[PDB]
Design a protein around this nucleic acid. Sequence first.
RNA 1: ACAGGUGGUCAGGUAGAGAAUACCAAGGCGCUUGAGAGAACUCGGGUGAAGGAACUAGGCAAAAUGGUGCCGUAACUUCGG
RNA 2: UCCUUGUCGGGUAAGUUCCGACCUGCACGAAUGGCGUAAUGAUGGCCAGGCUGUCUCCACCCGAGACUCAGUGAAAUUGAAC
RNA 3: GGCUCAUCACAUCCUGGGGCUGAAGUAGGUCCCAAGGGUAUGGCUGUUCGCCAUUUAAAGUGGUACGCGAGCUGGGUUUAG
RNA 4: AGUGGACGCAUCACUGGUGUUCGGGUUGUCAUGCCAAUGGCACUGCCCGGUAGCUAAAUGCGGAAGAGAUAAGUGCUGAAA
Lengths: 102, 209, 98, 120, 113, 122
Amino acid sequence: QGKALQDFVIDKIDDLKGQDIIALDVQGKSSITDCMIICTGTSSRHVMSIADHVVQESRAAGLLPLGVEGENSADWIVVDLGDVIVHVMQEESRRLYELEKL
Amino acid sequence: MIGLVGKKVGMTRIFTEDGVSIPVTVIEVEANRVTQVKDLANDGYRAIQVTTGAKKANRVTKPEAGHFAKAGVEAGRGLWEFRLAEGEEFTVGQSISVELFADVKKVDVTGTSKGKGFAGTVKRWNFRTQDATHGNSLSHRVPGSIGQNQTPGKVFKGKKMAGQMGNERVTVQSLDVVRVDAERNLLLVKGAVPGATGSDLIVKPAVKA
Amino acid sequence: DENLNTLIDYRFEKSFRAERGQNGASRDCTGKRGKDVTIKVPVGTRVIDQGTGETMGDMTKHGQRLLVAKGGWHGLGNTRFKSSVNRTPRQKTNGTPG
Amino acid sequence: MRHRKSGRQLNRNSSHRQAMFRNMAGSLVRHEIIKTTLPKAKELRRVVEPLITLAKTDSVANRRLAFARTRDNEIVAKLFNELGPRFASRAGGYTRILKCGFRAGDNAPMAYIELVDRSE
Amino acid sequence: NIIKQLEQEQMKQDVPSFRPGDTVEVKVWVVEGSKKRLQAFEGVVIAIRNRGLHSAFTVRKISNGEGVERVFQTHSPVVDSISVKRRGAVRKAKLYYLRERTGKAARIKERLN
Amino acid sequence: MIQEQTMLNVADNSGARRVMCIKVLGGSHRRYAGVGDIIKITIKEAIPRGKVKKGDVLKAVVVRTKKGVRRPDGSVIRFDGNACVLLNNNSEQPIGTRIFGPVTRELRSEKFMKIISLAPEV
RNA sequence: ACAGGUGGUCAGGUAGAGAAUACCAAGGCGCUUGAGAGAACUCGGGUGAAGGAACUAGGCAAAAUGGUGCCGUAACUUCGG
RNA sequence: UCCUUGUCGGGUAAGUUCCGACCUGCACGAAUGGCGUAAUGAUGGCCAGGCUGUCUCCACCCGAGACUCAGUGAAAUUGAAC
RNA sequence: GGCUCAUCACAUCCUGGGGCUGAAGUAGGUCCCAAGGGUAUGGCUGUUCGCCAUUUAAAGUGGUACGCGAGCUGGGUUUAG
RNA sequence: AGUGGACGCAUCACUGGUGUUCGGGUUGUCAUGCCAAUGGCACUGCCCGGUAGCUAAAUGCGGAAGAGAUAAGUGCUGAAA
């Protein structure tokens, strides 16, 4: 089921200009997350729209997101689908954090 | 509806396939034979008197012995009545089992909780335990003030202070029902119920929604 | 004020007095500071004064507070004036008006 | 709060209690007659009866452990030699309570705790 | 009577026996969303509390220089397999003294049997 | 169980090392902060080259508690040393980039997915 | 027949520097009300999950260190500390 | 030192306490001695590390009372009391 | 004065129901009814009060001879130095 | 519809605390003739644990949802007029 939702999320984000897409596999390294997908956001408005987009297709796909974090700050925001977790980040803000070290 | 009569036996937790622990209370409620049926015309209220268990014939008081003889049932440890609720009617000598509680799924259990003897104020009403140091003399856990100055001059009855707690009727409401067994004479209810191991208690359907 | 654009709240209520600092009480009880009343103003309101008709600051962003009239100074009780030169502290020091 | 608790302390500390029954167990075995107040005799069954059933079998280690109690070679020699075979066919209840009124000192409940036969 | 019979019907009969101080590998189930994985857990048991179906044991491991203590219930479906790697050699039922001493100076030898 | 007037450890690369919790949050007469909560702290010790300057007051999140958490199957996760991860004042976003040490799984329901994404151990 | 005060003479063994301390030798005693109940509460203590002075006027009380051998030991200073 | 919680800085999140600086000395002042002083103090105040039931917050346990029984058996006070 | 224990009144801090509103919605302002419940922790001084930090929806105001020392402490008041 | 803060009831089954009537480690000493093995004293001699019971920080629940008459208020019919 993980691969199906992985394809379902990677296509939708790319439909609204989602650049720098890298699919990670943390199976074995960590026991919390199954798949890791990373995304880039230029600034605050559209990355919130991406978070708004993914959360509302999830409600239309049956799977209910079990937690979000981004509030009154668009430097980071997460939308969760269980096995697959999406990290949409600001390009300037990402460089402070790690890229492909998780 | 009516309830049932059981008694605490022990505490255990039941395991679900999802990996959730539900601590249940083991209650043994056997066939509660009805000893008397009360009607509005003869008694002013509709209720049935029920008993359970067996009592040694030597200790069965003779006036009590005739009471069970009229009902056609053998001796019991007590004679509690559970009120009726406008539409279910029973007969004298009828036996009711655990299967009645197969759909209630929420019960309130009441009984005589453990007696604490002459417990203190702190153990009874959870007072604030005046400081035990900084010069305090001969008063570390005493109630302290109990009233006002020369104004009225009495302590209002109902004051919370030292006395006897426990060994009194107490009810815990809306206890989740986990499993009911009629063949093995078992009643598993989520949570804890008053009383000690072997103390008699009565279980009724929850009055709350 | 970003979540409004109305200005009638200035004609409906034109005169307001900040509460006078309560006088000192016995038992050496000081007077509580008068609660600071916050006047919400819509963005883009330049303020002028009778006298120095220069703006203290233009309102551009949302979520900042600007002081337009500082409060006075509390008075001094006779307890603070305890001494042996007078040997009888009874003089009173009133507070400076805002 | 003494709920489901067993064993008294008789307004006496632990050091006294162990020594108290140390003499009590030895005296009962040595003489097979006692005039003590009921709470002593009632609580006396805690010690002596486990000692007698400790003598059901004879062993070097068993006697050493039995020697840790009664603090006496003479008392333990009396066990494993006559108390054993006499009580071999009896499973428990080696002592009997026989209340005997009140003493003249402070009117305490007087009682007898005794062996079944005492072979006397 | 009725309590003991209720205890035994829910009992797990495939739990291996380990000593108080052995190195034990335990796999614990996780309930997350709809799919479940197995979590392998390293550590050494420091305490054993065998009490009916509610028997429990405490295991300790060191991660990133910080000690974490984990407890389990022997007869619960959350745990899947409890395997012993090396058998310890200690005469204390409760290994509560491991907290004070540092890890590198508190290695436990093998039982040799 | 962590209440006011206590010093804790730091589980991120923000710069602080010894922090002292400033006030428990959650409601009136809140005696104890759990493991998933918003606990605000103050700095008692930090590296001078770090992002945070010693003595500042700012929010944090507790990650490790000596008592531990309560699993739904009667299990606890005991630790060795209380730890916290810093937060911004107005926003509940932690400032650190790395998280050191394991983290309990109960924080998933707590809605603090910063720590869950980081901290590869558990 | 009082938990008080009262000067000198003799000073065993063990470990200990010791007339401190713990046990013991000869010797002298169990202190002239006890037997029970194991409540609040009062007094003297033991221990304690997490916190570590957040209580209080005040670290009050408690709690804590405590010996031996080696290394090492700051400002100041009258050169001794 | 009335204006003294004088004004500023340090210490703490917050310091009418404490330390440093500024002199506007009501009422400092040189044997009814002034200025510094190592050491010393069951001397006053403040701060720090450890420590802990002081406290959050109380629970259990051990002994002496308190309670029952038996013997001996007190005192302040008291106009009269249903 | 602090600790402990509280009681009552409403001139209501929140929660509850409405009028007006200069009530677009949210967030509010005033007034009416309503006492059922709840109605902070700390640093500073003995301080009640109060300055500040920080929470909650709230840290309400009063009476009770400004409650409560045959309940506790004596930090201010304190005869004798 | 859930999850929390404060309060109340139950609870030992889970997490623990106590658990001087349980076991074990160990110091000094005395004693049981001696080796070995045990007992007393030194706060339970100092400690490590831990049965039951009690207990909270541990887990289950409770405040209701409703009904009748109502305050402020909103109304219908509706004359006095």
